């Protein structure tokens, strides 16, 4: 219709990992590893119509994420809040305008995917190490698959849910 | 839907 966006902000804080989803800057889902039932929950009524299969799916994603976050937190203590923000902006034609993958540690940018969805900006020498690993392993192409595909598709789904 | 980070730093 007009422009729209989806973003997830994932943080693990020493640790309690938290994930919050936004559509058009409005929070719609949430996961916290401090609650009685660490599990994604809808935050707005229009997400409630998603069947139990959905919630189970993304909850499992979240537990896996907790793991990734400890490995990389401890990793970082090696070379608190670990933050991963990602998502997509789409134009009036519903097509991808811009994709984001931004990794930050303790309030400082660590590595982030450039607008080309192909190359990486890193500042730290250490981030230069990561950039190295990921250039070789094809991390940019992997994330680009999400941002150009699933991210757009889920955003349209959530806009319809509303 | 959220995504798997997949890659490690």
């Amino acid at each position: 219709m007009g422009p729209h966006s989806m973003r997830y902000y994932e943080t693990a804080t020493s640790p309690r990992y938290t994930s919050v989803g936004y559509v058009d800057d409005k929070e719609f889902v949430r996961f916290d590893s401090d609650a009685e039932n660490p599990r994604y929950e809808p935050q707005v009524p229009w997400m409630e119509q998603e069947g139990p299969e959905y919630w189970e799916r993304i909850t499992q994603i979240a537990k896996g994420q907790e793991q990734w976050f400890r490995v990389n937190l401890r990793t970082l203590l090696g070379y608190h809040t670990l933050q991963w923000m990602y998502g997509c902006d789409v134009g009036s034609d519903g097509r991808l305008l811009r994709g984001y993958e931004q990794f930050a540690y303790d309030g400082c940018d660590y590595i982030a995917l450039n607008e080309d969805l192909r190359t990486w900006t890193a500042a730290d020498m250490a981030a230069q190490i990561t950039r190295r690993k990921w250039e070789q392993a094809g991390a940019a192409e992997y994330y680009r698959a999400y941002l150009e595909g699933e991210c757009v598709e889920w955003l349209h789904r959530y806009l319809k849910n509303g | 839907s959220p995504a798997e980070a997949g890659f490690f730093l």
Partner: T-cell receptor
Amino acid sequence: AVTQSPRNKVTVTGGNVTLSCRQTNSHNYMYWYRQDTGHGLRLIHYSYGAGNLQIGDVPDGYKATRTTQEDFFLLLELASPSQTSLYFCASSDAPGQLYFGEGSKLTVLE
Amino acid sequence: SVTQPDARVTVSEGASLQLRCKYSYSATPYLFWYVQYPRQGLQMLLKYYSGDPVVQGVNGFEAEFSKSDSSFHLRKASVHWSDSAVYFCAVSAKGTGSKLSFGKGAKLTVSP
């Protein structure tokens, strides 16, 4: 650098067999596959980290345990002849990119 | 699911190779080729996540993603006796990218 043990094993039906796999190179994802002619590799069980177990395509007759990030075990608690196969452990640090151990050939005899 | 159309292929040493692979998922999945030399485990030869459809691998291998045909054929310009091995197409589904499934494999004999 994925190490699996034993590389060779022979057991009788009803036998108890544990296959061990350890990886030093710090990965999260680990996998157990069997390879058989006519079938390629089929995934039995897999894991994203300590304490996580996910069933593969051919879990029946197998249990698995991921006790540490380094260690992934495959248990055949009551071995049957159909479990005669070549078994591979693998680990990964990137979606779909897997590093394989050298294989464990098992024969189950009646 | 990936399908490779022939369980065994023989080529003459020095000749070109194409090993075919089709996938059955609707949404383009993550795609890979692995090789298994005699008596070893498998080793990744190449992969495709997105972008350029022609991907390069180790040892002169390439593969080509075709959205149209849902295929991902492996090619090599000229094969050597030492390329005799089993080659496996593999896939993981979008949204479950770490669950890797293999095809049945193509046993390549290169005749010297």
